[PDB]
Amino acid sequence: SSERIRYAKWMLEHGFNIIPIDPESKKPVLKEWQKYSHEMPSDEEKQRFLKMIEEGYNYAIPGGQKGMVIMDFESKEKLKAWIGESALEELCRKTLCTNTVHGGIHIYVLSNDIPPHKINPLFEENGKGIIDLQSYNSYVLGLGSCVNHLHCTTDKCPWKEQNYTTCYTLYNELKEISKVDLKSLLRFLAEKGKRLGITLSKTAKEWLEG
Ligand SMILES: [Zn+2]
Ligand SMILES: [Zn+2]
Secondary structure: OOHHHHHHHHHHHOOOOOEEEOOOOOOEOOOOHHHHHOOOOHHHHHHHHHHHHHOOOEEEEEOOHHHEEEEEEOOHHHHHHHHOHHHHHHHHHHOOEEEOOOOOEEEEEEOOOOOOOOOOOOEEEOOEEEEEEEOOOOEEEOOOOEEEHHHOOOOOOOOOOOOOEEEOEEOOOOOOOOEOOHHHHHHHHHHHHHHHOEEEOHHHHHHHHO
8 A cells, every 4th residue: 555554564563663643733643652662552552553544644663662763864965975975875775764854864773772861963063963863752753754844934844834745755775774883883973074064962972982
């Protein structure tokens, strides 16, 4: 059927919980969705969730689950200039990467050492955050979810008030979320970005240096 339901089922198939997003509130259908970073909803809730998604609801994937976190970059073209085409392609060759509805890129990874607390933004350029690590108490919309930008009136949306719809799509091809050495990755990004005005945030460098 739809890509939205296919990918939602694919995440569940791999042991990751998902939660429907209410069409109106644009927030998870359950207020206490954070519990899904540590336990499953059970057969009942699951079927109910899948029905909402099949009927058209978008869905989200809570971070932190089984050591899975999502590096949420605001701009894909910026990352390409940042680490280079070769580095980006290799990274997305080894793990799942997706295009966001605003031109960003989500890189899903598994890590044995997840920050015990929020250290966002990870990096900044010209005094502003350009990437956030989505871990516990956060989520990202999943593949197939679509957003109509007509109601977006902030400068965070490039498509401000446009009668235009975009969706979360695969960067290249569907691939398993694989393990990465998070701290080693961040050091690579730090080294590559210094010559482009991209630097780690105070809290990020803190954790990175222990
Ligand atoms: Zn928007
Ligand atoms: Zn698999």
